[PDB]
Ligand SMILES: C=CC(=O)Nc1ccc(-c2c(-c3ccc(OC)cc3)c3c(N)ncnc3n2C)cc1
């Protein structure tokens with residue numbers, strides 16, 4: 001692993017704590033980092049640390065390195081989980097990231113189902129994530145794994161995109177290759193990502209529409225009752241999810257535009273941000 005002093009953090013100033021989540025690419029633990037904020041070199045900050053599991057594979061390590069590099073290239077934004085540092089030399093690979101105390105968005109929403117959530121809160125949540133994707137797209141980055149489970153909520157109820165393990169630069173896609181997009185969850189995936197084996201920002205817009213549906217169902221599971229094996233046939237025939245109850249007609253029409261069959265006819269993240277900003281302002 002090449003040295004990157006800009007992002008390197010000393011191992012002796014990092015103390016691992018309770019585990020936060022345990023998936024399949026790795027594990028995440030809460031930790032205390034002393035001096036991670038360079039202006040406060042003696043203060044210990046609570047952070048999250050992603051590392052490999054004991055049964056990790058070679059691909060797991062390459063995915064973790066790719067995720068680290070992508071978060072280095074992306075840059076800083078209010079609605080993106082902030083990379084804080086990395087332990088990469090002489091020991092296990094640790095990726096140190098900002099700690100979001102309220103967990104992922106799906107559980108956050110499902111827990112606040114009848115501090116209950118209002119319509120304004122859901123619109124504000126959607127606007128924040130639209131902004132986050134607009135910034136990502138401006139950096140020529142495609143997320144490819146947009147979903148409520150991959151959004152984190154901070155103590156101040158700020159929404160952060162996270163889990164960049166599948167994210168790629170817009171030009172770093174093997175177009176029309178049979179293996180391309182094979183590790184994307186099918187119920188959040190744009191049809192062309194599987195029918196044509198391409199991925200653009202308009203594919204992310206589709207996923208964002210699915211994310212919107214998750215948000216206004218307060219954490220519902222997309223395409224309820226429809227197994228993955230039958231979904232894509234129905235999508236080819238024009239099936240789309242019905243309007244959630246807590247949604248306005250205008251927001252559902254926005255979801256359906258995100259789900260246009262023709263990618264170029266879907267809205268861009270900039271248009272989504274403008275429309276959501278108008279809607280959120282009117283709600284005041
Ligand atoms: C199965 C695939 C998979 O990775 N799942 C998964 C997704 C998220 C989390 C996760 C994080 C988190 C997210 C991205 C990171 O990037 C290096 C680091 C930590 C986090 C956090 N920073 N603060 C509070 N809670 C958090 N959680 C729960 C754990 C497992």
Ligand SMILES: N[C@@H](CCC(=O)N[C@@H](CS)C(=O)NCC(=O)O)C(=O)O
Pocket residue numbers: 057058061
């Ligand atoms: N691409 C090389 C290096 C990437 C890497 O870090 N691989 C891990 C597998 S867990 C390793 O220990 N490789 C042995 C080495 O560093 O030469 C490889 O996979 O062998």
